[PDB]
Design an enzyme around this catalytic site. Structure first.
Site, PDB file in Angstrom:
ATOM      1  N   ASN A 258      -9.249   4.444   2.860  1.00 42.76           N
ATOM      2  CA  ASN A 258     -10.066   5.270   1.986  1.00 42.76           C
ATOM      3  C   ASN A 258     -11.035   6.200   2.670  1.00 42.76           C
ATOM      4  O   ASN A 258     -11.742   5.787   3.586  1.00 42.76           O
ATOM      5  CB  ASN A 258     -10.853   4.379   1.020  1.00 42.76           C
ATOM      6  CG  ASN A 258     -11.387   5.147  -0.167  1.00 42.76           C
ATOM      7  OD1 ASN A 258     -12.519   5.610  -0.145  1.00 42.76           O
ATOM      8  ND2 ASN A 258     -10.565   5.292  -1.204  1.00 42.76           N
TER       9      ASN A 258
ATOM     10  N   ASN B 206      -7.989   9.278  -5.878  1.00 42.35           N
ATOM     11  CA  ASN B 206      -8.597   8.427  -6.892  1.00 42.35           C
ATOM     12  C   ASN B 206      -9.545   9.287  -7.706  1.00 42.35           C
ATOM     13  O   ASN B 206     -10.698   9.530  -7.286  1.00 42.35           O
ATOM     14  CB  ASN B 206      -9.377   7.265  -6.253  1.00 42.35           C
ATOM     15  CG  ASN B 206      -8.536   6.431  -5.295  1.00 42.35           C
ATOM     16  OD1 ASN B 206      -7.569   5.785  -5.707  1.00 42.35           O
ATOM     17  ND2 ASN B 206      -8.936   6.389  -4.025  1.00 42.35           N
TER      18      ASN B 206
ATOM     19  N   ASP C  69      -7.018   7.858  -0.599  1.00 47.10           N
ATOM     20  CA  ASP C  69      -6.399   6.890   0.304  1.00 47.10           C
ATOM     21  C   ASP C  69      -5.292   7.537   1.178  1.00 47.10           C
ATOM     22  O   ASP C  69      -4.399   8.228   0.655  1.00 47.10           O
ATOM     23  CB  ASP C  69      -5.761   5.784  -0.512  1.00 47.10           C
ATOM     24  CG  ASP C  69      -6.748   5.080  -1.403  1.00 47.10           C
ATOM     25  OD1 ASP C  69      -7.871   4.778  -0.959  1.00 47.10           O
ATOM     26  OD2 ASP C  69      -6.463   4.772  -2.568  1.00 47.10           O
TER      27      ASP C  69
ATOM     28  N   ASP D 259     -13.515   8.278  -8.532  1.00 49.10           N
ATOM     29  CA  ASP D 259     -14.639   8.464  -7.606  1.00 49.10           C
ATOM     30  C   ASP D 259     -14.472   9.580  -6.601  1.00 49.10           C
ATOM     31  O   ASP D 259     -15.248   9.656  -5.667  1.00 49.10           O
ATOM     32  CB  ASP D 259     -14.993   7.156  -6.901  1.00 49.10           C
ATOM     33  CG  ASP D 259     -14.068   6.825  -5.741  1.00 49.10           C
ATOM     34  OD1 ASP D 259     -12.884   7.208  -5.774  1.00 49.10           O
ATOM     35  OD2 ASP D 259     -14.455   6.173  -4.746  1.00 49.10           O
TER      36      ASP D 259
ATOM     37  N   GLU E  26       0.772  -1.231   0.000  1.00 44.57           N
ATOM     38  CA  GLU E  26       0.000   0.000   0.000  1.00 44.57           C
ATOM     39  C   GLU E  26       0.813   1.296   0.000  1.00 44.57           C
ATOM     40  O   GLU E  26       0.397   2.257  -0.639  1.00 44.57           O
ATOM     41  CB  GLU E  26      -0.984   0.076   1.187  1.00 44.57           C
ATOM     42  CG  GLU E  26      -2.091  -0.964   1.168  1.00 44.57           C
ATOM     43  CD  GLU E  26      -3.066  -0.819   0.022  1.00 44.57           C
ATOM     44  OE1 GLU E  26      -3.072   0.214  -0.660  1.00 44.57           O
ATOM     45  OE2 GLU E  26      -3.790  -1.798  -0.244  1.00 44.57           O
TER      46      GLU E  26
ATOM     47  N   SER F 216     -12.502  10.122  -4.138  1.00 42.20           N
ATOM     48  CA  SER F 216     -12.040   9.732  -2.814  1.00 42.20           C
ATOM     49  C   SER F 216     -10.505   9.725  -2.764  1.00 42.20           C
ATOM     50  O   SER F 216      -9.855   9.712  -3.800  1.00 42.20           O
ATOM     51  CB  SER F 216     -12.581   8.345  -2.478  1.00 42.20           C
ATOM     52  OG  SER F 216     -11.901   7.340  -3.237  1.00 42.20           O
TER      53      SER F 216
END
Ligand code: NA
Length: 130
Positions: free
Chosen positions: A60, A46, A53, A49, A35, A51
């Site tokens: 998220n 991202n 991380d 959408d 990650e 959002s």
């Protein structure tokens, strides 16, 4: 902060991650490595959408922390997403624990399926004294 491998493994053990909801320490290690590369300040927008991380576990914003700019989002860990960019990982670990309490468990992270599942993950903790 960027953790060294064994430093993180000892940290996560002290924080009670080894065997949490059935997940061995070596699995949490494989997750953090893929990650973020053990990097607490890692973020990834991202575009698809809207959002983001956050942090060492790339948690998220749609479901787990509040950053205010994610549409239709919830805040299941009850944290500002900011909390997940600290050098101290206490809040990140508590939120990770919350994620895996849902039915999917560790499968919540697609990286874990790609990189960690059915693999020999022993290498991530070998020689660390945990
Ligand atoms: Na949110």
């Amino acid at each position: 902060k960027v953790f060294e491998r064994c430093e993180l493994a000892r940290t996560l053990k002290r924080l009670g991650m080894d065997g949490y909801r059935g997940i061995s320490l070596a699995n949490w290690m494989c997750l953090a490595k893929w990650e973020s590369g053990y990097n607490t300040r890692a973020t990834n927008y991202n575009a698809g959408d809207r959002s983001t991380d956050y942090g060492i576990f790339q948690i998220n914003s749609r479901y787990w922390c509040n950053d205010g700019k994610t549409p239709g989002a919830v805040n299941a860990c009850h944290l500002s997403c900011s909390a997940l960019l600290q050098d101290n990982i206490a809040d990140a670990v508590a939120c990770a624990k919350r994620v895996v309490r849902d039915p999917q468990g560790i499968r919540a992270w697609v990286a874990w399926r790609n990189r960690c599942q059915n693999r020999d993950v022993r290498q991530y903790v070998q020689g660390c004294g945990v």
